[PDB]
Every structure is written in C-alpha cells, then in structure tokens.
Write a protein that binds this ligand. Structure first.
Ligand SMILES: *[C@@H]1O[C@H](CO)[C@@H](O[C@@H]2O[C@H](CO)[C@@H](O[C@H]3O[C@H](CO)[C@@H](O)[C@H](O)[C@@H]3O)[C@H](O)[C@H]2NC(C)=O)[C@H](O)[C@H]1NC(C)=O
Ligand code: 5GP
Ligand code: AMP
Ligand code: NAG
Ligand code: NAG
Ligand code: NAG
Ligand code: CA
Ligand code: CL
Ligand code: CL
Ligand code: CL
Ligand code: CL
Ligand code: CL
Ligand code: CL
Ligand code: ZN
Ligand code: ZN
Length: 726
C-alpha cells in the first residue's frame, strides 16, 4: 500500500537502513502556499493532512518582509532578515555595484548579491553534503561553495522529474550521498497569480502538489526511508487577490514624471532614474511629504526607510531604496498604469503580519513531535532548527536558537539567558543641590528631605531587565512605586519598571514645568526645567507616569525626579500622554493589571540594534547651546497573566505585548486631520507593535530572566507577534 494509507504511528527512534547512520533532512517548498489553503481545503489534500496530523504543524508560519519568493526562500536557509542576507526582493538595484538584480537575468548568478551563510554552505564547512533540486542561491557559488549536487534553476523541468532525481540521490553510497536536500515547486504560486487565490484553478493546483508530496513519501517508503527522514514542508509566503480598483498610481499626485523609478506592488520602493549619480542626493523627503495624507483613508503611506515599523527589519541594506511605501491589505502601488503588470491578478509582497501572507510549515519525521500544533513562528527560526537536525553549529543569524525546541521530541540545543555585560554600581546621594528653574504649582508635594524586597518585587515581578550593553555604566534607582535603570554614561534612564493594577487611580492635577533634582545622579544642564522652557525644538517626557499614585491621592512626586525624564518632542507627547492617560488604564482593566517597562531607544544607523558610543556621539545635536541625544524611538513592554484571575504579581504564565514607537517631531505619519485621537494613537501603536526580542535587540536589555519557565519557553514568549486577521 501507499504511505498516505498507512495508519499514523509514533517514530520514537529513527528506523533507518544500515547504510544510514542518521536521518537526512529534506526542505520541500510549495511556492505561494498560503496557510489558509490548508485551513479551508484540508479535506481535499489527504497527503498533506496526514503529514500535519501525524507531525508538527503551525496554523501560520510568519514570513519575512517583503513577502516575495527570493527574500523568503533565502531567509529560510540563512536564518537572516533580507536586509542582512542581501536579497531584499526579486528585483533590486545596488548603487555601489551600479547593477540590477532580476530572476531572468545573468545577475541572478552573481555571487555579490548573496550574503550570509546558507545551510548548504554551513553543512559543507562541517563535512556534511548537500543536494539541492532548485532553491534561490543554490545554483550560485556562495563563499566559493556550491551544493554537492545542484541544479541550475529551470522552471520547465516537470515536477515528477525533480522528485525522482532526489530519490536517486538518496540511493548514492555514503561517501557521495547528501545529508541535506531541497525540493521546490512553482505551484500553487502560479495558479494563485493567474486565477486568484480563491479559484477552482488553485484547488486543482493544491490537489496536484498534494499528489506529488505523496509520490515523494511513497518513494521514501519504497526505499525504507519513510521513518528515517526529517521532512520540512514549507512555503515562502501567502497570496492575496488584487484589484484594478485597489491600485495607487503616483502620477495622480506628481503628474506624468519620468525622473523616478518605482518598484511596483504592495511593498513599493522609489529611486531616481539617474543612478548612481543622484542615488543619495535625490530629495526623497520632499517626495515623501508630497505623497503624505493626500486622500481620506489613504490606502498607501510613504516611509523613509528608517521610519518603517522596526518589526519589519527592512532598512539596513543599501539595496533598500531611501523611500518605501506601506500598503493596506489587497492594495498595490505603481508610478503609473504603464509601470506595472496586470492589476487584477493574485499577488503577494504585503506586510508579513497580514493573515493572507502567512505561510505553510509542517515538520514530519523521527525528530518532530506527532500530532503537535504550535503557535506561529517566523521563518528565520528554521535555519537553527535545520542545523540541529543535521548536527551543525549555526552561523550567526537572527533566529533565537532554542525557541523551536517545543517542536522536537528530543531538543538538541539547550539555550541560556544572555549574560549581563553592563557595569552596575550604586549611585550615592550627593548633598549639592542646584536651581533647576522650575515653577512647581502649589498642589505639588515637594520632597523636603531626600535622604526592600517587597517593593522591589512589586516593581520588577519577573526580575529586573538585564543590561546587555557591553561595559555600559548603570545604577539602579529604587522608588516606592517604580525602579529605574539609570545610565551614568548618557545621564538619562534606560528603563523604568512599574506595576499598574486594575483598581489603581490616576491623579487629575497638573504638573507642568515641575521637576525635583535626583541627588543620586550627576546633574546635567539638560536635566533642568529652564533648558526646555519655551524650547520649540524639544521638550521632556516621563517614563513612569506621575499621575499614577497607588497609595496616596496626589501627584506622585517621586516620578518628578530628574532621573525619570527623557528628551521628547511636543508632537510625540500627544501619543505618549494619550498612551499613559487613557490607554494604559483600559489595558489594566482588560488584563487585570499590567506591568510596564518603558525607555528610550537609540538606533541612528537603523540596524535594529543598539548604537555604540561612537555612533551616539556622531548623532548628538546642539540645542540651546547644549549637546543632547534625542531618542529615535521609545519602547514599552506590557506584561500580565494568561489567566485573568491573576494579577501581574502572581502570574502562572505571561501575556506580553511590546511596541517600538517612532519618535518623530510631527505626526504626519498618522494623518491626524479629522480623526479621533482615540483611533489614530491606538492605530499607530498597533502598527508599531514588536516582538519582545525586537526590543531586546535595539535596547541591549534582556527581560524576564528571573521567571521559572525554561529559557526556551521564554524565547517563545519573547519572539511572538500577533497577526492582523483580515
Ligand atoms: C541579524 O543577524 C546578523 C548576523 O549576526 C546581524 O548582522 C551582523 O551585524 C554585525 C554588526 O552590524 C556585523 O558585524 C561587524 O560589522 C562591521 C564589519 O562589517 C564591523 O565594523 C562591526 O564592528 C562588526 O564587527 C556582521 O557583519 C553582521 N553579519 C551579517 C551576516 O550581516 C544583524 O545585526 C542581525 N539583525 C538584528 C536586527 O539583530
Ligand atoms: N503581480 C504579479 N507578479 C507576478 C505574476 N507572475 C509572476 N510575477 C512576478 O514575476 C517574477 C517572475 O515570476 P515567474 O516567471 O512566475 C517574480 O518577481 C514574480 O513575483 C503575476 O501574475 N502577478
Ligand atoms: N531558483 C530560482 N531562480 C530563478 N527564478 C526562480 C527560482 N525559484 C523560483 N523562481 C521563479 O520565481 C517566481 C516566483 O516568485 P514569487 O512570485 O515572488 O513567488 C517564478 O517565476 C519562479 O519560476
Ligand atoms: C551604470 O551601469 C550602466 C549599465 O547598466 C551604465 O549605462 C552606466 O554608465 C553606469 N554608470 C556609472 C556611473 O558607471
Ligand atoms: C529546461 O528543462 C526542460 C526539461 O523538460 C528542457 O526541455 C529545457 O531544455 C531546459 N532548459 C535548459 C536551458 O536546460
Ligand atoms: C513637495 O515637493 C517639492 C519638491 O518639488 C518640495 O519643495 C516641497 O517642499 C514639497 N511639499 C511639502 C509639503 O513638503
Ligand atoms: Ca543601531
Ligand atoms: Cl546588502
Ligand atoms: Cl529594481
Ligand atoms: Cl488611496
Ligand atoms: Cl506579486
Ligand atoms: Cl532525527
Ligand atoms: Cl516564575
Ligand atoms: Zn513565492
Ligand atoms: Zn508569486
């Protein structure tokens, strides 16, 4: 009988022919197989359903942005964001090479496009052979290496021939046989484009690839390998239905210009035509502002690339144009109707948290659990996983090694929390006080005389954030209601942590132009009220909100300490004040309290990681005759319990939400004219949600280290991001 007809049985030990010391791994891509195809038509796909039911499955594998074939396939086999592995789209221009990349051109085989270390190169360096029957990058010499058996891409090769060849490769003698294999099919991507994702044609394509996977499995069974092979069935992205009525043309606002080139689609990019001469001198900001807030409920938004949501990690490469566009679901953008393909086809490329962009993942074999359904994870985590299946040490990458251990019968790698590399000190009281220039109102209660586990636990119930910032000088400042990690190198707080219960009340009093000098920290001129007084360029904001006073009735005066302020634009205060005066109270009511950590972010070189000291010094600004460092973003992490009966101080299990809010000196991003503040501030927050791990990378902080969950369980928590359901 066939493999699909056999009953599902646990493979607790690999059942291998004597000529196999261990099971191979096969990575099998079904291009453009959106996660929902299996949600809805699983009854029509018996083979893929058995792999899912007898294996390890997630309803949604999150792809990378932009959700295109080449960036995502290459992310899968490198563990890297496209901005790091260099393949940021199927078509690219590189201003330093002055070259264009495309899939149907000679440049596809130019090794200079492909960065990082794909898994077959990792394997080569560690004496493991590879056999690839198509995979982006696998027919290109990368690090002077090619797969041991590889095929130049040719989409005309019949699907059956591809599967048959891998089955012959598996019969080679040990000294020639690969241990890692790839297979790739162009369906159901092709039918999804030509006829739309919801069509009888896509269904026929799904049935066709399901039959083909069964041909593979039956071949493995014939070879005695169907219980000696770790199968990863995967896709690169999902599929959306495009419309000629949902297509933006920039010539509507710019006129019929030809001095710019637009990469059309849902993740459009813009550069001048006169390159490389004007690639950097072109006035991108003027163009972006001419395209901002032009329509009510505008379905596209221009972004200079450092200002895109950090969760997309789409800016560091010089192949990413300085101007990009963010598109609503189902919408696309081109310069004009002549600079695009057909406007009514299936398409992809959109935000990688859109539901219809989500991808397929099934793991089947000795190493994978049987009948396990796990929460969503990003495809950059798969490289580490394949390294564990193959016995390989991973190259440095963006996956969190160990975060997928719950997919495995017997985890290979036991992860550890990162060490604290900061220099921690106690900050003593200095008895010298200076005039800050403040004009505190009469109802503000002064701190007349300046000169603890329970208080400590209340403020940091999961352990204090750890300082990963190498050799950075930090002292902890304890208050009754919050804890501060204070930077002695920057003279501003790196984080503040406090807990906010459902019944806690906020104060109504004003506290304008009022601060109290923290005698435990060195006094800076940019600590004083007089620095920010009538300062049109810059104001200051608080990390812990002074209106929150759990025990007393007035403004919480300890939150007015100079150790609790950060430089803050007036425009961003609209967001920050609404967040802390309105949203936080509702979230505490919805979540039975929330614990909060917030702080500044400095990522001036837009690489998603904290800046070195030399980078900070280069980006200092003189404002009112003083050097000042203005954060690029502000982060906030909200934690509460899975069970609503528990307060954030007694959680059996954690519920985490994180955000990395851009710190812009206007609110043009939100097109605020005619909108309720309730709507647009919360909409901005949702768009700029992030993984906890994203916050960790960009601040050099590590969270939750005193929790009793295993490190791998905490990595799952910290790598999660909610999908926007359509
Ligand atoms: C995703 O993982 C990537 C791999 O670890 C990581 O990229 C690495 O980033 C570092 C720092 O930018 C680079 O290291 C060196 O870079 C230059 C020389 O090119 C030096 O001046 C630096 O001091 C440093 O020694 C690595 O070259 C780079 N590796 C790769 C493959 O790109 C990304 O930073 C990670 N992304 C995020 C958001 O965490
Ligand atoms: N919008 C759109 N792009 C397509 C379609 N078919 C192929 N492409 C794009 O054209 C390139 C080559 O596709 P392949 O030849 O199917 C890729 O960048 C792919 O995304 C289609 O029907 N619509
Ligand atoms: N290794 C490859 N080299 C070149 N083109 C490829 C390769 N793999 C897939 N393709 C093509 O990429 C296109 C699909 O891209 P996408 O629509 O972004 O999913 C189709 O034209 C495929 O034939
Ligand atoms: C860039 O390359 C193109 C070839 O595609 C060539 O026409 C142009 O002269 C080059 N520009 C420079 C500055 O070398
Ligand atoms: C692509 O594959 C088909 C196999 O059916 C073959 O006819 C064609 O010649 C191949 N193209 C190249 C360039 O090898
Ligand atoms: C629109 O573009 C022009 C450049 O042609 C620029 O001078 C102008 O400042 C832009 N408008 C806005 C509102 O930024
Ligand atoms: Ca940085
Ligand atoms: Cl690059
Ligand atoms: Cl391009
Ligand atoms: Cl629009
Ligand atoms: Cl597309
Ligand atoms: Cl195994
Ligand atoms: Cl715990
Ligand atoms: Zn694809
Ligand atoms: Zn496609």
């Amino acid at each position: 009988k066939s493999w699909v007809e056999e009953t599902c049985e646990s493979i607790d030990t690999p059942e291998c022919p004597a000529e196999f010391e261990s099971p191979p791994t096969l990575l099998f891509s079904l291009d453009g197989f959106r996660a929902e195809y299996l949600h809805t038509w699983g009854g029509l796909l018996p083979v893929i359903s058995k792999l899912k039911n007898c294996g390890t499955y997630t309803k949604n594998m999150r792809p990378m942005y932009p959700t295109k074939a080449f960036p995502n396939h290459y992310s899968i086999v490198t563990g890297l964001y496209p901005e790091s592995h260099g393949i940021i789209d199927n078509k690219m221009y590189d201003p330093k090479m002055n070259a264009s990349f495309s899939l149907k051109s000679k440049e596809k085989f130019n090794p200079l496009w492909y960065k990082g270390q794909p898994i077959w190169v990792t394997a080569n360096h560690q004496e493991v052979k590879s056999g690839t029957y198509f995979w982006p990058g696998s027919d290109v010499e990368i690090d002077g290496i090619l797969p041991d058996i590889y095929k130049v891409y040719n989409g005309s090769v019949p699907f059956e021939e591809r599967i048959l060849a891998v089955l012959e490769w598996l019969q080679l003698p040990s000294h020639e046989r690969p241990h890692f294999y790839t297979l790739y099919l162009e369906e159901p991507d092709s039918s999804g484009h030509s006829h739309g994702p919801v069509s009888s044609e896509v269904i026929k394509a799904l049935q066709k690839v399901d039959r083909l996977v069964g041909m593979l499995m039956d071949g493995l069974k014939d070879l005695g390998l169907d219980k000696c092979l770790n199968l990863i069935l995967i896709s690169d992205h999902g599929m959306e239905q495009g419309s000629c009525k949902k297509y933006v043309y920039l010539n509507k606002y710019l006129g019929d210009v030809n001095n710019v080139k637009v990469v059309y689609g849902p993740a459009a990019r813009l550069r001048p035509t006169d390159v490389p001469e004007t690639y950097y001198s072109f006035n991108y900001e003027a163009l972006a502002k001419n395209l901002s807030c032009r329509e009510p409920n505008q379905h596209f938004r221009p972004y200079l690339k450092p200002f895109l949501p950090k969760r997309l990690h789409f800016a560091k490469s010089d192949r990413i144009e300085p101007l990009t566009f963010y598109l609503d679901p189902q919408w696309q953008l081109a310069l004009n109707p002549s600079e695009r393909k057909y406007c009514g086809s299936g398409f992809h490329g959109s935000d990688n948290l859109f539901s219809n962009m989500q991808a397929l993942f099934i793991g089947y074999g000795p190493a994978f659990k049987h009948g396990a359904e796990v929460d969503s994870f990003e495809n950059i985590e798969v490289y580490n996983l394949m390294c564990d299946l193959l016995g390989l040490i991973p190259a440095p990458n963006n996956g969190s090694h160990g975060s997928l251990n719950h997919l495995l019968k017997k985890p290979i790698y036991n992860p550890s929390h990162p060490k604290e590399e900061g220099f921690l000190s106690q900050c003593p009281i200095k008895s010298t006080s200076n005039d800050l220039g403040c004009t505190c109102d009469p109802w503000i209660v002064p701190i007349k005389d300046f000169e603890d586990d329970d208080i400590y636990h209340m403020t940091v119930p999961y352990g204090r954030p750890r300082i990963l910032l190498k050799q950075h000088r930090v002292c902890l400042l304890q208050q009754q209601q919050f804890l501060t990690g204070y930077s002695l190198d920057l003279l501003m707080p790196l984080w503040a942590s406090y807990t906010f219960l459902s019944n806690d009340q906020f104060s109504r009093d004003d506290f304008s132009n009022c601060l109290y000098q923290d005698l435990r920290i060195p006094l800076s001129p940019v600590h004083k009220c007089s620095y920010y007084k009538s300062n049109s360029k810059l104001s200051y904001g608080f990390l812990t909100p002074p209106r929150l006073n759990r025990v007393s009735n007035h403004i919480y005066s300890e939150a007015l300490l100079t150790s609790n302020i950060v430089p803050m634009y007036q425009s961003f205060q609209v967001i920050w004040h609404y967040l802390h005066d309105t949203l936080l109270q509702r979230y505490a009511h919805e979540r039975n309290g929330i614990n909060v950590v917030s702080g500044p972010v400095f990522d001036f070189d837009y690489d998603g990681r904290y800046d070195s000291l030399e980078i900070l010094k280069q980006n200092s600004r003189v404002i009112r005759s003083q050097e000042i460092l203005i954060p690029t973003h502000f982060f906030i992490v909200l934690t509460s319990c899975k069970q609503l009966s528990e307060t954030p101080l007694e959680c059996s299990a954690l519920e985490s939400s994180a955000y990395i809010l851009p710190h812009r000196p206007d609110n043009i991003e939100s097109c605020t004219h005619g909108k309720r503040e309730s709507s647009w501030v919360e909409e901005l927050l949702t768009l700029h949600r992030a993984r906890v791990t994203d916050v960790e990378l960009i601040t050099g902080l590590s969270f939750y280290q005193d929790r009793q969950e295993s490190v791998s369980e905490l990595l799952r928590l910290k790598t999660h991001l909610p999908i926007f359901s359509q």
